Design a protein around this nucleic acid. Structure first.
Length: 106
RNA sequence: AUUGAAGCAAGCUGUCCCUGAUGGUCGUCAUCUACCUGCCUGGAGUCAUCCGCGGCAUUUAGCCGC
């Protein structure tokens, strides 16, 4: 089975997903420290809001693949390279899949 | 302020080349709630013919439809 030939020369991949609140018609947006909800005026005048930052989206999208109790990848992803920290007593302190800076941490 | 030029400190030296961007989770709990009279008395009234004088007439030279 193959799919990469269709993307072997394309310059970029773009994907869009449309959501709805499951019940009711409200949601809680990100509470950024300096201003709370990040509202701004759109190019076409209309009010706009940023739900969350792409850095937080990345912190989530990396986490969905790590099984924190086992300290291992999900079964389909098991065996891929990862570096893991242990404390002086050998307990699993942290791993770079969950670290902030990804190989540049204290 | 003027006939015979203040209309007069007038000619006086500052140019083109440079990439400031890689990555940071602002997130969890909170009961706003209970009692109360709006209402009340007050005159808007009164008389004034839709007919058509249009059209024909530049018209008082003279009449005629719906």
């Amino acid at each position: 089975m193959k799919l990469e030939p269709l993307l072997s020369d394309v310059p970029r991949l773009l994907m869009e997903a449309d959501l709805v609140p499951v019940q009711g018609t409200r949601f809680q947006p990100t509470g950024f420290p300096d201003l709370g909800a990040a509202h701004y005026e759109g190019p076409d005048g209309r009010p706009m809001l940023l739900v969350e930052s792409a850095q937080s989206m990345a912190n989530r999208l990396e986490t969905v693949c790590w099984d924190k109790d086992a300290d291992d990848w999900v079964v389909p992803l098991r065996g891929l390279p990862v570096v893991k920290v242990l404390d002086k007593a050998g307990k699993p302190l942290t791993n770079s899949v969950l670290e902030a800076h990804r190989l540049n941490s204290p």
